[PDB]
Amino acid sequence: KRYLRHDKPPYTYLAMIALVIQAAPSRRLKLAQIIRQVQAVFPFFREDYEGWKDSIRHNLSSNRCFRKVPKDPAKPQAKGNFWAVDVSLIPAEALRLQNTALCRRWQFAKDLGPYVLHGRPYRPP
DNA sequence: AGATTGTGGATTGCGA
DNA sequence: TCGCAATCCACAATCT
Ligand SMILES: [K+]
């Protein structure tokens, strides 16, 4: 299939995943919860493109900041892991608002650092 | 069997 | 001009 950019929130997948994880009482979430929460918290995805869900899954594995946490520490788990974030491994620029066409046509928090790094609750207009 | 989680090779578009 | 997030896809192992 032809590569296409699709409308999405103007924050990295890393940032959005980290934000919803850090907002979870236990600071960890499963994949399906991460997907539902990202869309809920950043509702700039379109009904006609589902591939952002694959990109979320890809970002959990591709970024060192995400940690696969087994239900039982003593028993690693092929599947169904919780995901946590090591904020020390988040690149600083990863949390910055992105200057995309979608950002520009709407003009958003300038940086998600308060919510990911400093325990603040995310509450967008 | 088919769907899902987890991983990862690889190319793209586009902001800087 | 090109770094790099975004994105398309394949696959292994496991869940339903
Ligand atoms: K990871």
Numbering used by the authors: 26 to 132, 140 to 157
Paper text:
Forkhead box H1 (FoxH1) is an essential maternal pioneer factor during embryonic development that binds to specific GG/GT-containing DNA target sequences. The members of the FOX transcription factor family share the presence of the forkhead domain (FH), which interacts with DNA (InterPro entry IPR001766). Most FOX proteins recognize the canonical forkhead DNA motif TRTTTRY (R = A/G, Y = C/T). In contrast, FoxH1 recognizes the TGTG(G/T)ATT sequences in several cis-regulatory elements, such as in Gsc, Eomes, Nodal, Mixl, and FoxA2, to confer activin regulation in vivo.
To decipher how FoxH1 selects GK sites and how the extended domain contributes to DNA binding, we determined the crystal structures of FoxH1 proteins from three selected species, H. sapiens, D. rerio, and X. laevis, bound to a 16 bp native sequence belonging to the mouse Gsc promoter containing the GG site. The three GG complexes were refined at 0.98 Å (D. rerio, C2 space group), 1.47 Å (H. sapiens, P21 space group), and 2.8 Å resolution (X. laevis, P212121 space group). The root-mean-square deviations (RMSD) between the three vertebrate GG complexes range from 0.47 to 0.65 Å, indicating high structural conservation between the proteins. Although the human construct includes the engrailed homology 1 motif (EH1), this part is not defined in the complex, thereby suggesting that this region does not belong to the globular FH domain. Wing2 starts with two 310 helices (H4 and H5), followed by an isolated β-bridge formed by Lys185 and Asp202 in zebrafish and by Arg121 and Asp143 in humans. In the human and frog sequences, which are longer at the C-terminus, we detected a short coil fragment that turns back and runs antiparallel to H8. A comparison of the three GG complexes revealed the presence of a mammalian-specific insertion of five amino acids, 134-GlyGlyAlaArgGly-138, which is located within H7. This insertion cannot be accurately traced in the human structure due to intrinsic flexibility. At the 5′ site, these additional interactions occur through contacts from Lys104 (human sequence) or Lys168 (zebrafish) located in Wing1 with positions 2, 3, and 5 of DNA.
